[PDB]
DNA sequence: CTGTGCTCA
């Protein structure tokens, strides 16, 4: 598990834009996108706002802070919510969660913007 | 594969 953590870091460390997270707020509550998805990323709210699954909630945000260009993954960890699964997760781990969430949605946007 | 998630085949 934890070597799959490290060959995925290591690729979307590479790929980020190398800005801290306060930069990934600062730059999109400044525009003006869907107040759904601002809601989440100004940290106002999270999935309880549009009572959507707690791992799609999370799913679309990640998504969409990578066609920013965003993906180092200490981000994604840093703006995680915490009334998520990764909270406690009584029959799993936060590093399962999430090196399997990052390694779907990090396939995903890769092969968008592949050339 | 794992709890499942998209947008787009
Ligand atoms: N619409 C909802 N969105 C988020 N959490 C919900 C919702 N309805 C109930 N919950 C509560 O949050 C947890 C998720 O319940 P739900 O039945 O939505 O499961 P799920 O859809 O399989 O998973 P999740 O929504 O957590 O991704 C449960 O503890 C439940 O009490
Ligand atoms: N029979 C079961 N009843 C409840 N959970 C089960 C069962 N079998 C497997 N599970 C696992 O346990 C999870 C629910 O407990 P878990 O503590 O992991 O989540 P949570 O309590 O909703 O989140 P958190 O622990 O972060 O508050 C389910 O999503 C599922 O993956
Ligand atoms: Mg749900
Ligand atoms: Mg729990």
Redesign the pocket.
Known sequence: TVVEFEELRKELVKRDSGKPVEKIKEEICTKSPPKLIKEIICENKTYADVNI????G???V??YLM?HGVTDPDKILELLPRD???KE?E??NTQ??F???LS??WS??KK?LEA
């Open positions: 699954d707690r791992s799609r999370d799913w679309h990640i998504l066609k998520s699964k990764a997760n029959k799993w399962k969660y090196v399997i969430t779907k949605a995903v946007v968008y």
